[PDB]
Ligand binder design. Structure first.
Ligand SMILES: N[C@@H](CCC(=O)O)C(=O)O
Ligand SMILES: [Zn+2]
Length: 290
């Protein structure tokens, strides 16, 4: 009954590239097709890996490509109190613990945590915070791909919520912020499929409503290899041929003679003609984007 709310949540570790344009465009078109809101959140939660100016570049790029968000941009750098608040609640509820294990130790036992500190009652001193999983989620529904079966060992891990170095974990921040922003459906890149079950486990532990999920096509280079595996910035010039290429990647109708249309017209038509079922599970990008 309530309005659809979707979002694009880029990390400012670089400017937009074709893969992140796919995520922005796919989430935008699905949100607009569903007559819903489309939010933008800057995930600037890791200062060291952030590039000064990149977040602003991204927002400017979105506008250049005709993708206008609703309301104000949320900045994770302004949400640290919210992550702290959620961690405090988990601790009071008996749903988290402090872990003093080294990376060397975890590597030596196969790379997946064994729950060593689960009942040792360490304090927060020089410790990471781990979630105390109860009933890990190992499968989820993707509205496009159907039921996904996750890697069981990774899915069942008491994963990190707050790193030893003090940074809040992505899995924590994304759940806290999507819930805070009232996100009802998460439409995002294929590279984010695996952590989905952990995020769902976390919604369940908070006692919050689990949103819907759509993972967009896996991007391949022309040789058929994963594109994400190690990317040219989006052209600063005419965005139209790039938008047309992105629509084609998403299996949508794409006007070959884009010269007689504005960016806004191309997008308006893309919303009207959006067919989620036409979005493929993988797609090959052209050489211009590899
Ligand atoms: N900033 C993260 C979050 C993605 C998401 O959950 O939509 C990324 O771009 O990889
Ligand atoms: Zn430990």
């Amino acid at each position: 009954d309530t309005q659809y709310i979707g979002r694009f949540a880029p990390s400012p570790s670089g400017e937009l590239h074709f893969g992140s344009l796919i995520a922005a465009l796919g989430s935008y078109l699905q949100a607009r097709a569903r007559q819903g809101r489309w939010l933008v959140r800057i995930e600037d939660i890791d200062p060291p890996r952030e590039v000064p100016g990149a977040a602003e570049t991204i927002l400017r790029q979105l506008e250049h490509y005709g993708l206008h968000w609703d309301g104000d941009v949320l900045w994770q750098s302004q949400r640290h109190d919210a992550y702290r608040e959620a961690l405090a609640w988990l601790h009071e509820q008996g749903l988290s613990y402090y872990c003093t294990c080294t990376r060397a130790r975890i590597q030596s036992i196969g790379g997946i945590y064994d729950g060593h500190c689960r009942v040792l009652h360490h304090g927060p001193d020089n410790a990471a915070v781990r979630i105390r999983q109860q009933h890990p989620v190992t499968q989820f529904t993707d509205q496009l791909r159907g039921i996904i079966h996750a890697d069981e060992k990774l899915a069942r891990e008491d994963f990190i919520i707050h790193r030893r170095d003090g940074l809040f974990a992505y899995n924590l921040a994304v759940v806290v912020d999507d819930h805070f922003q009232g996100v009802t459906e998460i439409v995002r890149g294929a590279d984010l499929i695996e952590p989905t079950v952990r995020q769902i486990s976390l919604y369940q532990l908070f006692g919050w409503k689990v949103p819907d999920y759509i993972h967009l096509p896996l991007a391949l280079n022309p040789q058929g290899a994963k594109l994400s595996k190690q990317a040219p910035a989006l052209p600063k010039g005419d965005p139209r041929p790039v938008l047309i290429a992105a629509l084609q990647f998403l299996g949508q109708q794409a006007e070959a003679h884009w010269q007689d249309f504005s960016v806004e017209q191309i997008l308006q038509s893309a919303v009207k003609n959006w067919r989620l079922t036409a979005v493929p599970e993988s797609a090959i990008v052209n050489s211009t984007f590899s």
